[PDB]
Design an enzyme around this catalytic site. Structure first.
Site: not given
Ligand SMILES: Cc1cn([C@H]2C[C@H](OP(=O)(O)O)[C@@H](COP(=O)(O)O)O2)c(=O)[nH]c1=O
Ligand SMILES: [Ca+2]
Length: 132
Positions: A17, A31, A36-37, A39, A77
């Site tokens: 992401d 971002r 939300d991917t 980690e 970001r």
């Protein structure tokens, strides 16, 4: 107030992401909004990373689209929806069960209903994060 995609220049995909763009001639991390991917070192992290990487790297072009609110986060970001040859990466991750709908702030939520429609389909099909 309408959203508009603009031409973007990829430096490299970073993980599921985040991507690095050359934004107005400066390298800048972006971002992806509303997702939300995992980690990399969590389950489905490598898969989400590789899906975003292939989608942005292999595209003829990419575009970024800010929402109506904050354009940069508290870590500097950029916050955008990213399209690869017109297909929204944020939506595609959600539709494949490689990201959750997440970080929904009022005022940068234009594509929330679209993304929760994609997530409901990924959950019905028990894809990836939602697999049993
Ligand atoms: C997607 C998104 C994340 N964030 C912030 C919230 C999380 O910060 P904190 O937990 O430090 O509060 C962080 C998560 O990013 P990553 O998922 O890239 O780790 O990025 C925003 O502030 N706005 C956003 O729209
Ligand atoms: Ca993440």
């Amino acid at each position: 107030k309408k959203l508009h995609k603009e031409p973007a220049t990829l430096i490299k995909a970073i993980d599921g992401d985040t991507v690095k763009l050359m934004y107005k001639g400066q390298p800048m991390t972006f971002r992806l909004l509303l997702v939300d991917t995992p980690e990399f070192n969590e389950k489905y992290g490598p898969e989400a990373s590789a899906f975003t990487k292939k989608m942005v790297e292999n595209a003829k072009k990419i575009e970024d689209e800010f929402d109506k609110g904050q354009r940069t986060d508290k870590y500097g970001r950029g916050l955008a929806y990213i399209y690869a040859d017109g297909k929204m990466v944020n939506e595609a991750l959600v539709r494949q069960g490689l990201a959750k709908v997440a970080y929904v702030y009022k005022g940068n939520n234009t594509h929330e209903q679209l993304l929760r429609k994609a997530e409901a389909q990924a959950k019905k099909e028990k894809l990836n994060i939602w697999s049993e």
